[PDB]
């Protein structure tokens, strides 16, 4: 006593407009991000001869953002063809590894920056420069290793296929056949718990503490301002939140809590791509927020 | 992961450990990304779960439904 119900989704309609516009915006982001990050690294390396004390996190964060931007053109090529993957097998694995490592590096370094900034006005205030330099170097190496460990798995299982029916190539992920669901949820939930939730929580708490401390001290209040402090948290949220709501909605679709319908597939596809665009805008808004504003940096920019 | 390196379609993972007794509503999807699939609705948890077409009774039912 059962029933059979047939539902045929119409062939995917025209998608030239969306793909073309997203590629257009990606080119702008690539140019305006690569240029800014290169200048910041150059100034940071050059400043050390003027007696300044540049911060290692800024240099490492700049490198991480630069690496992420370099690989946008690969996605642009792979996107104009509606997710096809003409490139070879090694390209897919290598490109994903680079992107994942250098995108988690930036997210972790933001949290490390927040903690270091609070401690540098509360705790490190009477520590010799050598000790703080050593501590920062150790943390830099540790963060790189942690990002590499998190990113390795997804790259291991990646592989290409050619659809038997449609006969076009694709690059997907193949998991053990006895734990397919567990791996998918796990590897799309690690990017949401170790990518947004924990880093954002730490950043919010520690910048709030820094704001309270700076307000309590009259002398610091006159020079520094509390607009930039809250600007840091708001920029991170606005950039990343939409993407990690689309992904969290994609997971719900996998589990079939959301009933399926012809519209859901198209809506989720458009939402994921459009939101990933902003997720990368974060990679160019970073130098404009951390280095281009500091008065000392600008004075060093013109002189170099 | 970047969206390009993903595969999107109704069912991404099968569930073979299902019993003919606990099935109330089938569904034969047909999507360009994953060709024909099967989506069922268990009558206990009311959770839409995929189903593997290799099960014998599933095969007989589906051939009868489509051919007619």
């Amino acid at each position: 006593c059962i029933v059979v119900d047939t539902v045929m989704c119409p062939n995917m309609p025209n998608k030239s407009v969306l793909l073309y516009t997203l590629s257009f915006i990606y080119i702008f982001i690539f140019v305006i991000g690569m240029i800014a990050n290169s200048v910041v690294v150059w100034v940071n390396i050059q400043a050390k001869t003027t007696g300044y004390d540049t911060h290692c996190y800024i240099l490492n964060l700049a490198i991480a953002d630069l690496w992420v931007v370099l690989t946008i053109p690969v996605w642009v090529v792979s996107l104009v063809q509606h997710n096809q993957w003409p490139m070879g097998e090694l390209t897919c694995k290598v490109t994903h590894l680079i992107f994942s490592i250098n995108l988690f590096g930036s997210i972790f370094f933001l949290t490390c920056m927040s903690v270091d900034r609070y401690l540098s006005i509360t705790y490190f205030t009477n520590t010799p420069s050598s000790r703080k330099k050593m501590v920062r170097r150790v943390v830099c190496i540790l963060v790189w290793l942690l990002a590499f460990c998190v990113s390795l798995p997804d790259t291991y299982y990646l592989k290409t296929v050619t659809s038997a029916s449609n006969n076009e190539t694709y690059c997907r992920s193949f998991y053990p056949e006895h734990s397919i669901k567990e791996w998918l949820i796990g590897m799309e939930l690690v990017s949401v718990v170790l990518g947004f939730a924990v880093p954002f929580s730490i950043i919010a708490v520690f910048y709030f503490l820094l704001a309270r401390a700076i307000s309590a001290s009259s002398d610091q209040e006159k020079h520094s301002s509390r607009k930039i402090i809250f600007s840091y948290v708001v920029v991170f949220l606005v950039c990343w939140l939409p993407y990690h709501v689309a992904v969290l909605l994609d997971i719900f679709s996998i589990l079939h809590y959301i009933p399926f319908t012809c519209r859901l597939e198209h809506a989720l596809f458009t939402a994921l791509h459009v939101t990933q665009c902003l997720s990368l805008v974060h990679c160019c808004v970073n130098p404009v927020l951390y280095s281009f504003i500091n008065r000392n940096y600008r004075y060093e920019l013109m002189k170099a | 992961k970047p969206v390009s390196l993903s595969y999107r379609c109704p069912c991404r993972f099968f569930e073979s450990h299902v019993a003919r007794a606990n099935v109330k509503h089938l569904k034969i999807l047909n999507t360009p990304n994953c060709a024909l699939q099967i989506v069922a609705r268990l009558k206990n948890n009311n959770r839409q779960v995929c189903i593997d077409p290799k099960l014998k009774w599933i095969q007989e039912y589906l051939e009868k439904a489509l051919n007619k």
Partner: antibody
Amino acid sequence: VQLVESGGGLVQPGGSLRLSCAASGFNFSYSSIHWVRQAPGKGLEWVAYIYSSYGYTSYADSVKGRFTISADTSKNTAYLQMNSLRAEDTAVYYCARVYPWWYYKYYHGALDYWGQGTLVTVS
Amino acid sequence: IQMTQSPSSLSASVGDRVTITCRASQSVSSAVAWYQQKPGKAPKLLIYSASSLYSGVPSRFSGSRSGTDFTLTISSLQPEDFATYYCQQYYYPLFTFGQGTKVEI
């Protein structure tokens, strides 16, 4: 189910012909149609297939760039037009239907029902 | 993806056991099928996937896999089971058929 072929007949070498496979008794807009050959006194051979609903098409190497394949869902019939026929194509052509179920690694491809087929000669 | 079937020719008698092997030059993930056709009729399907016996076929025929080596086993050859057996693979978009095996009294 019932599949019937039409169009088989004499053809001059280097000419063209058009065969139609008409299927009655199942959802044409779901299954996919497959054309295969059998040379006189030899084993079977694959030619091409058409996936009706979406129009995806693939072709065998030996007939790449020559045979054209179309599907009329309104007339639920499969058309195969052949041109520049060579002297090695004289055979018997069969029409089959396969339901492309989804398995994690591959799509179902077992030709279930075969039509009676028609003899195509190149003399 | 060239596919091979052996032995090309074979002989047996009613009440015997026969095995036919099919090998793939490349890896195919348990995606095969076995048909039989009479001397001048249309082919019929016997086994698909790798071992799932078709709906309307008796239980004499049984398929099995080993690495990449697909074997068909037939027991108690009835008089009607004197035909030509063909091995197919459908992993890749370009299907293929085996050379063909023949069995005679």
